[PDB]
């Protein structure tokens, strides 16, 4: 009520979208609010790629507050690549606006089949300045530097399909969203919202592991070796050459992920990382986990984690707040 609140909706009960506009005239767009990137892009009227056929497009000519740039840009993600150029206009998030530098995408061929298979228009990064391309100060930071918000921090309360809507709260924390106390973990770097925690699954542990809280990732990312040791005696079936892991949803051997610090302990049991795949077979589930190796052993805590845990992203205090999310609002 006192801070900016953007309503969130789930997408195929895994990911979630939020809306925001560009230009002095509204011009709405559906975004993937990605704490794992630091750039903002939107499909341009100038787009020529097939993937833009179903999307809302941005038209600078119809915006008085438009400021041209033109410097070609290539935004790279783990899942794909999108091309275009830089531009600047009024970005309206929730109910606050600000002149912001963003990317006008015109080529989305490197982001298929994801882009055409999804209903979002663009991506709105919520990471750190250094993660951006073209030295762009985060939206929440800029907003704070302009006395538009009390604190430079945003909150995420993911939505549950047929249960409740979600919220991206900017500026302040609201107890309506979480239960119990909040616990903060300091960032180990000002790039992604990356913190350090011990990763313990079974008798397998990886201490001082790099954990990235990323709303832009649909799954739980685990280092390859860690995953393999993890699925050893379990009764999971990895379809040959595919990151497709199937099990009986009631499989009594399924472990609980346990991330710890001297401040708190965060767990993620089966019900949070399993996806029903009943259409495939009765009583069947898939792990929604992915083996992914980075320079430094990293765990990506995506939507599955954020779905169980209300999260606070503090730019001013360079830390992440974690608390148990409310079952219902």
């Amino acid at each position: 009520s006192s801070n900016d609140n953007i309503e969130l909706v789930d997408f195929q009960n895994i990911m979630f979208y939020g809306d925001a506009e560009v230009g002095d005239n509204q011009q709405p767009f559906t975004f993937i609010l990605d704490t794992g990137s630091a750039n903002l892009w939107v499909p341009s009227v100038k787009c020529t790629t097939a993937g833009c056929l179903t999307k809302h497009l941005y038209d600078s000519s119809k915006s008085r507050t438009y400021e041209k740039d033109g410097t070609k840009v290539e935004m790279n993600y783990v899942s794909g690549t999108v091309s275009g150029f830089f531009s600047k206009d009024l970005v309206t998030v929730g109910n606050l606006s600000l002149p912001y530098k963003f990317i006008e995408v015109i080529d989305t061929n490197g982001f298929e089949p994801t882009y055409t298979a999804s209903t979002f228009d663009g991506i709105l990064g919520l990471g750190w300045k250094d993660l951006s391309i073209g030295s762009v100060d985060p939206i929440v930071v800029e907003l704070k530097n302009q006395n538009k918000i009390e604190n430079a921090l945003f909150t995420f309360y993911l939505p549950v399909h047929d249960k409740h809507t979600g919220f991206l709260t900017i500026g302040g924390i609201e107890e309506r969203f979480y239960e119990g106390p909040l616990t903060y973990e300091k960032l180990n770097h000002d790039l992604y919202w990356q913190i350090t925690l011990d990763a313990h699954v079974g008798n397998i542990m990886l201490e001082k592991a790099n954990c990235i809280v990323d709303s832009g990732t649909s799954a739980i990312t685990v280092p390859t070796d860690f995953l393999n040791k993890m699925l050893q005696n379990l009764d999971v079936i990895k379809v040959p050459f595919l990151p497709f892991y199937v099990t009986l949803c009631n499989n009594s051997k399924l472990p609980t992920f346990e991330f710890t610090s001297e401040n708190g302990k965060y767990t993620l049991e089966p019900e949070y990382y399993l996806q029903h795949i009943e259409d495939v077979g009765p009583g069947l589930c898939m792990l929604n986990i992915i083996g992914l190796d980075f320079p430094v052993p990293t765990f990506i805590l995506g939507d599955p984690f954020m779905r169980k845990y209300f999260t606070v992203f503090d730019y001013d205090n360079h830390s992440v707040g974690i608390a148990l999310a409310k079952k219902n609002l």
Binding site: M15, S37, G125, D214, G216, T217, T221, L292, I300
Partner: peptide, 6 residues
């Protein structure tokens, strides 16, 4: 799946 920057 989707894994969001380089």
């Amino acid at each position: 799946x989707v894994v969001x920057a380089x």
